């Protein structure tokens, strides 16, 4: 079994510094090629840097002179020091095990690095009212509007995870104001409006924000 | 009483880079002129010394190293170079004084369905010291579980074969490489030039 | 330095069919190509290495093919779990480069959308901003026209659309369009409507609410 | 042996782009590295960089790093030196030097390329007489000459009596005026007895402007 | 960046005598393994490309005559010419090829020494043709003098002029090993006709007193 657990991502100002970590299990890091591969949101994959088993390092031109890849045998961890960060560097960074500088067989879960001058803002949660007279599929609908937050991501649950059938949480869209908005809607029986209580659980870890909004008919 | 540079350059078969062959040339008169005269040389890079003035020098020993690598990898046969070939197969000292001579050999070292006989070391836990020859075929242990001589998870074969095909690009084609290393110590010279 | 082009950009096939994904390189790489599969929200999974050798644990239905400058990944007996974005990566020349990706979708019967319209919450209205949300739920195909009409006047430039990925249950999309207005502009008009055009609808379906009522 | 041949003289305005060449021939050229040396007018030799045509391995000087782009073409045995934005300070003679190895002395040198970067245009010379008079006679030895002023670019060749007068002739090196134009003085030493009898004519030829001026100098 | 400093800047040697140039380095150029100094000496005649004379600080390139010899080790190196000839007048550079970037020496000009010659001073008033164009140039000529060191002063109405003149000096003549200097004073026609006496004062080692050749604008 191979596990790669990543850490260190977040929101950092342009020109700032940030260090990513990658805990490795199932192999010895000092005896394997390892690489960092980044994927811009909505875009393809891009190889960043590689560290050889013998200690040699190589970096892509777009990050050379700014990124430094290192390893710690005693902690079995792979590191990437990202200094002089640019807005274009905003991407999900993957920690992958490299097979002789050829291909990546095992990948980490990936950590999101956002390089923007914008300040972190908590989300405002507003109810989408389920009018009982408005049925379009034999069912009524309701949801929560997660608006004006930065940076990504935002996770939305319903009834603390107890309600998962009929749940649709849309991808975040970037508004012209630079702040993200997100809608999560569920489809519920029109009869259960009076009896059942539906509560959405919005969690914004970048802002340490949690909201349990009760959506009710009006 | 001439030195046998022909056995090194005109050799019918060349060695793999992990098992690079060294010929100890001593007690002979080195012409050096059969080289720098043949036009079948892709690269002829001399560090510290000049081949033109080689016919006027005396050395206690002269070393010739023969192997075959890809065109992309000929760049790594140089002082202060890094890469898979430089770190794990053949490493030159950062103060190397000598010549690295390479030429294309697609006609000789490429078979129709791929030669696959020239190998290179893919895995190694530390970089080679200068002028080191690692011919180990031991299964590479990439984890903590012993490999017990078999290949599998965290246990790879350390050596990789070249896909030398005539239809490959210039970079992927085989290049025969000869490295001339000149030795001088506090001993009487044995390899002088024509004069 | 060397660019990989994947064709087609997007592909839609029913389960059980055969998928053929192409990867074209600007230079010969001599079978030094690998294939990856990236499901939404997850990391890439190594499928093929050496352009023909299948990675450990990968089902037999995946087979790598091709050499030189053109490559092909073939997926047989398409199961619902084999639908994701596929990338090709070459390692014949540094720096290693990836493809643009090939999205693999599921074909299914055309399903008409269910249209819901939500007036802005009074709690949001206190902040001075009004948001009207129009929801298109469980429809196929993905293409869907959504038009905002305020007092029978078509609206543009103040709406954003968001589409979910294909559902794992019924392989249907869901679309939400949000209309952002100030409270002053929101209360200057009465009828707010959402007009939806889709293949599964014979005529456009409009859901409207009158501010107040 | 090996011999290196460079391109012709270049006259470019500031901000233009220029790529000079250096082609090498002869045997044992596969081993030769090519380096570029800049010699500013009246100054010493400055090493800019070195390139090996076989693999285009280029080692740049820290001073010239990022200002030039030394390239090579191994198919025709030619090395190149180019600028993106030429500066008036880049006016110099650019030599390419060949060494049979790296950290090897430069055995072979090219003839050099005179690169002239100036906002001035190709202007023909203005030839004014330096009349002998009575203040330029130190006994029987009388001095006269021609003042060649406000021309561009170099060179200007000056003769006397169509080359029939070469004794005691001094043509001074051109001095670049603050106006960006060159001034040159050519003088001769002649017996004062021949001032009334012998006629002296200086021939000023400026090939870049296709100009030939024959100014007769007579006593005033 | 190894720095090479030469000495002297200028060297005067009689034909057939010994010439010596010193070259000092900021770092040892000797490669200890091969026991050779990665230093070279170059000869550049005016207008000519540099010519390699001695490499490895002791070895002579083919074609170089026996009079050139190289010496030195560590950081101090000397170039010696045994019997200087007329054809050896050039600027000599010492260059190191031990470490990139390559650095040359400042350069040492070597000239033939002769007997001191007093300059012949001539002054040329500006031509009428040039005066039509609004610019007046007054030329002062120093002819066939040695050594090269000379001082030229422009004095218009006994007022020393500075910032209005340029000088040009010839190379040492192949025949009498003498120099010639010309100083041109450039003035506008308006400024030229605002003064009467134009003088050129020459100070040289071969002159007991400073020689002044002068003319008047009103002829
Ligand atoms: C063997 O190598 C030599 C040089 O190392 C090549 O040239 C031979 O030797 C001299 C060189 O001038 C000449 O007699 C001929 O050019 C060559 N002679 C023979 C007998 O070949 C030579 O080409 C190499 N051998 C082959 C078969 O190519």
């Amino acid at each position: 079994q191979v596990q790669l657990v990543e850490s260190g991502g977040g929101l950092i100002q342009p020109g700032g510094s940030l260090r990513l970590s990658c805990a490795a299990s199932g192999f010895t890091v000092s005896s394997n090629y390892m690489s960092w591969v980044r994927q811009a949101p909505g875009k393809g994959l891009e190889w960043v840097s590689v560290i050889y088993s013998g200690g040699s390092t190589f970096y892509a031109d777009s990050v050379k002179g700014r990124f430094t890849i290192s390893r710690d045998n005693s902690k079995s961890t792979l590191y990437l020091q990202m200094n002089s960060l640019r807005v274009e560097d905003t991407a999900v960074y993957y920690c992958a095990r490299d097979f002789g500088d050829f291909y990546f067989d095992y990948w980490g879960q990936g950590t999101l690095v956002t390089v923007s001058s914008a300040s972190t803002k908590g989300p405002s949660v507003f109810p989408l009212a389920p009018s009982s007279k408005s049925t379009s599929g034999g069912t009524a609908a309701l949801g929560c509007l997660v608006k004006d937050y930065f940076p990504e991501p935002v996770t939305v649950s319903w009834n603390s995870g107890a309600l998962t059938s009929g749940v649709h949480t849309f991808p975040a869209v970037l508004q012209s104001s630079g702040l993200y908005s997100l809608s999560s809607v569920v489809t519920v029986p029109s009869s259960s409006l009076g009896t059942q209580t539906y509560i959405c659980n919005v969690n914004h870890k970048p802002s340490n924000t949690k909201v349990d909004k009760k959506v009710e008919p009006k | 009483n001439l030195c046998p540079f022909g056995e090194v350059f005109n050799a019918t078969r060349f060695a793999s880079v992990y098992a690079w062959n060294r010929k100890r040339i001593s007690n002979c008169v080195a012409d050096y002129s059969v080289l720098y005269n043949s036009a079948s040389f892709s690269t002829f890079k001399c560090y510290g010394v000049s081949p033109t003035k080689l016919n006027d020098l005396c050395f206690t020993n002269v070393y010739a190293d023969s192997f075959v690598i890809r065109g992309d990898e000929v760049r790594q046969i140089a002082p202060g170079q890094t890469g898979k070939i430089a770190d794990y197969n053949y490493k030159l000292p950062d103060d190397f004084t000598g010549c690295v001579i390479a030429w294309n050999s697609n006609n000789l070292d490429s078979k129709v369905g791929g030669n696959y006989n020239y190998l290179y070391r893919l895995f190694r836990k530390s970089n080679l010291k200068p002028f080191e020859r690692d011919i180990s075929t031991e299964i590479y242990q990439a984890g903590s579980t012993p490999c017990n001589g078999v290949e599998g998870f965290n246990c790879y074969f350390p050596l990789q074969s070249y896909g030398f095909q005539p239809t490959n690009g210039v970079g992927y084609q085989p290049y025969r490489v000869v490295v001339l290393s000149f030795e001088l110590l506090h001993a009487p010279a044995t390899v002088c030039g024509p004069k | 330095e060397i660019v990989l082009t994947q064709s087609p950009g997007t592909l839609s096939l029913s389960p059980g069919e055969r998928a053929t994904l192409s990867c074209r390189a600007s230079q010969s790489v001599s079978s030094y190509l690998a294939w990856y599969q990236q499901k939404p929200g997850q990391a890439p999974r190594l499928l093929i290495y050496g352009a023909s050798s299948r990675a450990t644990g990968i089902p037999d239905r995946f087979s790598g093919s091709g050499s030189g400058t053109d490559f092909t990944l073939t997926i047989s007996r398409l199961e619902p779990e084999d639908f994701a974005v596929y990338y090709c990566q070459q390692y014949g020349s540094s720096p290693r480069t990836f493809g643009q990706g090939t999205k693999l979708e599921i074909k299914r019967t055309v399903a008409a959308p269910s249209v819901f319209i939500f007036p802005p919450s009074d709690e949001q209205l206190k902040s001075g901003t009004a948001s009207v949300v129009c929801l298109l739920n469980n429809f196929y195909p993905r293409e869907a026209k959504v038009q905002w009409k305020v007092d029978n006047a078509l609206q543009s430039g103040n709406s954003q659309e968001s589409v979910t990925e294909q559902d794992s249950k019924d392989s249907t999309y869901s679309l939400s369009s949000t209309l952002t207005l100030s409270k002053a502009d929101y209360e200057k008009h009465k009828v707010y409507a959402c007009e939806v055009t889709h293949q599964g609808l014979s005529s456009p379906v409009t859901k409207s609410f009158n501010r107040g009522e | 042996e090996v011999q290196l041949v460079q391109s012709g003289a270049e006259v470019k305005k500031p901000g233009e782009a220029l790529k000079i060449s250096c082609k090498g021939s002869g045997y044992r050229f596969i081993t030769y590295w090519i380096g570029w040396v800049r010699q500013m007018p009246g100054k010493g030799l400055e090493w800019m960089g070195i390139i090996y045509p076989g693999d285009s391995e280029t080692r740049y000087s820290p001073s010239f790093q990022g200002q030039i782009t030394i390239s090579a073409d191994k198919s025709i045995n030619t090395a190149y030196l180019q600028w993106s934005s030429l500066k008036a300070s880049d006016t110099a003679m650019y030599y390419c030097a060949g060494s049979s190895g790296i950290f090897t002395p430069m055995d072979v040198w090219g003839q050099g390329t005179t690169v002239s970067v100036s906002s001035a245009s190709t202007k023909g010379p203005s030839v004014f007489p330096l009349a002998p008079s009575s203040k330029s006679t130190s006994g029987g030895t009388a001095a006269l000459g021609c003042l060649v002023k406000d021309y561009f670019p170099e060179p200007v060749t000056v003769s006397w009596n169509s080359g029939a007068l070469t004794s005691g002739v001094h043509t001074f090196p051109a001095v670049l005026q603050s106006s960006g134009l060159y001034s040159l003085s050519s003088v001769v030493t002649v017996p004062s007895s021949s001032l009334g009898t012998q006629t002296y004519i200086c021939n000023v030829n400026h090939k870049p402007s296709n100009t030939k001026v024959d100014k007769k100098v007579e006593p005033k």
Side-chain angles (χ1 to χ4, degrees), chain A, chain B, chain C, chain D:
Chain A
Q1 72 293 344
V2 160
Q3 270 193 312
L4 295 174
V5 185
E6 287 155 290
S7 170
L11 175 60
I12 182 62
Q13 308 194 42
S17 297
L18 188 58
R19 193 171 72 115
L20 305 180
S21 305
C22 181
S25 183
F27 62 94
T28 55
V29 292
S30 58
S31 306
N32 286 268
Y33 300 74
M34 298 226 62
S35 302
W36 287 95
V37 186
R38 73 181 173 183
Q39 183 185 17
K43 310 191 188 304
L45 301 164
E46 177 183 5
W47 169 84
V48 172
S49 65
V50 63
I51 176 179
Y52 282 17
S53 47
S56 302
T57 63
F58 296 102
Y59 312 87
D61 297 330
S62 50
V63 303
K64 187 171 301 179
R66 304 183 296 109
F67 290 9
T68 305
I69 183 171
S70 61
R71 67 157 75 105
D72 198 332
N73 309 336
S74 56
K75 302 186 183 65
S76 187
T77 309
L78 181 67
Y79 302 103
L80 183 66
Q81 178 69 29
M82 300 185 303
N83 306 331
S84 301
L85 282 169
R86 308 171 184 174
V87 184
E88 43 202 326
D89 295 333
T90 294
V92 170
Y93 283 77
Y94 289 97
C95 161
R97 217 259 298 271
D98 212 339
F99 184 85
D101 197 52
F102 293 156
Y103 54 89
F104 319 93
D105 49 1
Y106 295 88
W107 294 64
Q109 84 281 356
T111 179
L112 175 55
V113 179
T114 309
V115 186
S116 178
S117 59
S119 300
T120 304
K121 182 167 181 297
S124 305
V125 183
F126 305 115
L128 296 181
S131 53
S132 187
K133 295 297 182 179
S134 311
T135 74
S136 186
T139 57
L142 54 92
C144 282
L145 179 54
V146 178
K147 189 181 182 61
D148 293 329
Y149 68 88
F150 188 88
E152 298 192 35
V154 154
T155 63
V156 182
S157 303
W158 282 92
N159 293 341
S160 302
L163 176 55
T164 54
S165 185
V167 185
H168 290 99
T169 298
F170 297 88
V173 296
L174 186 58
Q175 305 175 94
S176 53
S177 60
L179 270 50
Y180 294 94
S181 287
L182 179 147
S183 304
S184 177
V185 295
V186 308
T187 315
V188 301
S190 50
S191 304
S192 300
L193 266 307
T195 70
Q196 255 292 339
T197 64
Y198 301 101
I199 300 178
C200 72
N201 319 90
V202 184
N203 175 69
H204 186 213
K205 289 183 180 180
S207 173
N208 292 327
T209 302
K210 286 195 293 180
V211 171
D212 291 2
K213 189 78 188 180
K214 171 176 292 183
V215 289
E216 51 203 15
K218 181 184 58 181
Chain B
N1 198 29
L2 61 153
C3 298
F5 284 106
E7 292 181 334
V8 178
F9 286 81
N10 289 3
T12 309
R13 53 95 192 173
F14 264 49
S16 294
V17 64
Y18 80 96
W20 51 272
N21 272 325
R22 164 165 292 192
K23 180 68 177 66
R24 187 176 187 270
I25 286 185
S26 62
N27 293 321
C28 52
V29 188
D31 190 5
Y32 296 122
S33 79
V34 283
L35 280 38
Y36 73 65
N37 283 335
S38 181
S40 64
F41 283 137
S42 177
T43 62
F44 201 142
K45 303 215 292 179
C46 293
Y47 298 75
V49 296
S50 159
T52 65
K53 308 302 181 300
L54 225 48
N55 297 17
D56 308 323
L57 293 167
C58 288
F59 308 93
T60 181
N61 282 312
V62 173
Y63 295 138
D65 295 336
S66 317
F67 51 84
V68 162
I69 53 180
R70 271 172 43 184
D72 304 80
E73 306 163 351
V74 191
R75 190 68 167 270
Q76 304 180 26
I77 311 298
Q81 279 284 346
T82 173
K84 288 200 279 282
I85 293 300
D87 301 358
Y88 308 139
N89 292 268
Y90 188 89
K91 177 60 178 177
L92 287 175
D94 296 355
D95 55 356
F96 171 72
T97 48
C99 303
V100 281
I101 316 175
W103 66 94
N104 193 285
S105 57
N106 193 34
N107 301 329
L108 293 84
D109 293 331
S110 294
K111 301 303 178 296
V112 179
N115 193 8
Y116 294 111
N117 282 7
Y118 291 105
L119 312 184
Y120 67 98
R121 180 161 301 280
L122 185 60
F123 296 101
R124 199 169 189 275
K125 296 178 180 180
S126 60
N127 299 331
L128 283 177
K129 308 189 74 174
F131 290 140
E132 197 170 7
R133 185 170 180 260
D134 195 330
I135 56 179
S136 178
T137 57
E138 176 186 355
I139 293 296
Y140 190 78
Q141 176 175 338
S144 49
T145 306
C147 294
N148 303 327
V150 81
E151 179 173 355
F153 186 71
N154 290 336
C155 292
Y156 325 120
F157 191 66
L159 272 54
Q160 180 82 11
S161 57
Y162 286 108
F164 286 153
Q165 303 174 14
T167 63
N168 293 341
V170 187
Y172 304 98
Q173 287 177 17
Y175 277 77
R176 294 194 170 186
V177 175
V178 187
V179 182
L180 267 51
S181 187
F182 307 102
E183 171 190 339
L184 248 186
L185 292 175
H186 287 245
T190 63
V191 191
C192 289
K195 81 175 192 185
Chain C
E1 176 186 352
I2 164 172
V3 59
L4 298 174
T5 299
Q6 258 168 307
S7 181
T10 172
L11 173 59
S12 193
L13 297 174
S14 304
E17 299 188 21
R18 176 169 296 178
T20 59
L21 292 76
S22 299
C23 181
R24 265 192 161 91
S26 61
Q27 300 182 22
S28 174
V29 278
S30 306
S31 77
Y32 297 157
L33 189 95
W35 287 93
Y36 299 90
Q37 175 195 61
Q38 186 184 37
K39 294 184 178 181
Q42 287 184 335
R45 195 172 88 180
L46 178 71
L47 257 49
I48 311 298
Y49 65 100
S52 184
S53 303
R54 174 163 38 88
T56 55
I58 306 301
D60 308 0
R61 47 185 180 269
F62 299 93
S63 67
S65 173
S67 178
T69 183
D70 290 7
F71 296 89
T72 297
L73 168 66
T74 58
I75 320 176
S76 310
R77 322 170 201 93
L78 285 180
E79 305 186 17
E81 42 193 331
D82 301 337
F83 294 92
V85 184
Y86 294 92
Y87 301 89
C88 54
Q89 175 233 347
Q90 59 82 30
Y91 50 92
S93 72
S94 181
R96 290 171 291 178
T97 62
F98 295 84
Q100 313 89 5
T102 296
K103 179 182 288 293
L104 185 55
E105 303 179 357
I106 299 185
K107 270 181 179 175
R108 63 149 290 160
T109 61
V110 174
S114 301
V115 185
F116 303 92
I117 179 168
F118 301 91
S121 61
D122 317 326
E123 310 145 23
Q124 186 202 13
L125 226 52
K126 307 173 187 176
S127 62
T129 306
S131 294
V132 192
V133 177
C134 188
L135 166 63
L136 288 68
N137 197 252
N138 294 332
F139 66 100
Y140 189 89
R142 176 165 176 164
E143 304 83 42
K145 186 180 184 182
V146 181
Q147 284 184 317
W148 287 95
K149 305 170 70 174
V150 187
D151 282 344
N152 216 20
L154 191 58
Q155 215 77 11
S156 301
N158 40 5
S159 61
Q160 286 180 309
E161 297 186 3
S162 184
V163 186
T164 61
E165 297 291 341
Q166 271 209 327
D167 192 7
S168 56
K169 308 156 191 168
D170 50 0
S171 65
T172 60
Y173 299 93
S174 292
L175 183 147
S176 71
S177 182
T178 58
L179 187 65
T180 301
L181 300 170
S182 58
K183 196 218 289 187
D185 276 326
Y186 169 70
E187 294 181 335
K188 280 160 54 182
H189 311 102
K190 188 190 307 173
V191 177
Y192 291 77
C194 178
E195 196 173 22
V196 168
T197 313
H198 188 258
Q199 179 178 342
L201 300 172
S202 304
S203 62
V205 167
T206 303
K207 293 302 194 65
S208 65
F209 74 93
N210 299 13
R211 179 180 46 83
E213 323 293 77
Chain D
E1 326 88 345
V2 182
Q3 45 188 1
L4 270 51
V5 184
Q6 307 189 204
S7 60
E10 313 275 359
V11 181
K12 324 286 287 185
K13 297 296 209 305
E16 291 196 30
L18 184 68
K19 186 177 69 175
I20 60 181
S21 58
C22 170
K23 181 181 180 180
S25 61
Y27 270 60
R28 57 210 49 87
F29 184 78
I30 315 177
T31 178
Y32 258 82
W33 297 58
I34 297 181
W36 289 95
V37 180
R38 178 183 75 174
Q39 186 174 32
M40 302 199 65
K43 314 308 167 190
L45 303 177
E46 313 165 28
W47 182 87
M48 306 172 68
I50 186 174
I51 191 175
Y52 180 77
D55 57 359
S56 292
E57 169 187 338
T58 323
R59 310 256 274 266
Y60 286 98
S61 171
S63 306
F64 295 85
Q65 180 75 55
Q67 318 289 348
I68 54 175
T69 304
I70 301 181
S71 50
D73 192 338
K74 52 186 177 181
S75 60
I76 52 181
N77 284 3
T78 302
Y80 297 89
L81 174 62
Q82 58 179 337
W83 294 263
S84 58
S85 178
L86 271 179
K87 317 165 188 175
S89 64
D90 287 331
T91 298
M93 278 207 58
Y94 290 90
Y95 293 102
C96 62
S99 60
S100 192
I102 185 85
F103 308 100
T104 295
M106 297 158 168
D107 308 329
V108 182
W109 289 73
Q111 78 281 4
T113 293
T114 309
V115 172
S116 311
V117 183
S118 181
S119 62
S121 298
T122 301
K123 178 184 181 302
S126 305
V127 185
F128 308 112
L130 299 178
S133 175
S134 178
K135 292 296 177 171
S136 310
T137 166
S138 64
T141 288
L144 61 93
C146 277
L147 172 57
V148 186
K149 182 177 171 59
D150 295 335
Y151 72 89
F152 186 89
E154 298 223 51
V156 157
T157 57
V158 185
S159 299
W160 281 93
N161 295 338
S162 300
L165 179 54
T166 57
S167 179
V169 180
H170 289 101
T171 297
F172 292 86
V175 282
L176 187 51
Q177 290 184 114
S178 55
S179 60
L181 274 44
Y182 293 91
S183 288
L184 176 142
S185 306
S186 177
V187 295
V188 305
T189 281
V190 302
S192 63
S193 309
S194 61
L195 261 298
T197 76
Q198 260 286 339
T199 73
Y200 299 100
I201 299 177
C202 75
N203 323 101
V204 179
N205 167 69
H206 185 226
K207 301 206 174 187
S209 185
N210 196 23
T211 309
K212 294 184 180 181
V213 182
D214 298 347
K215 198 59 198 299
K216 180 197 182 74
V217 277
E218 44 194 6
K220 181 180 58 182

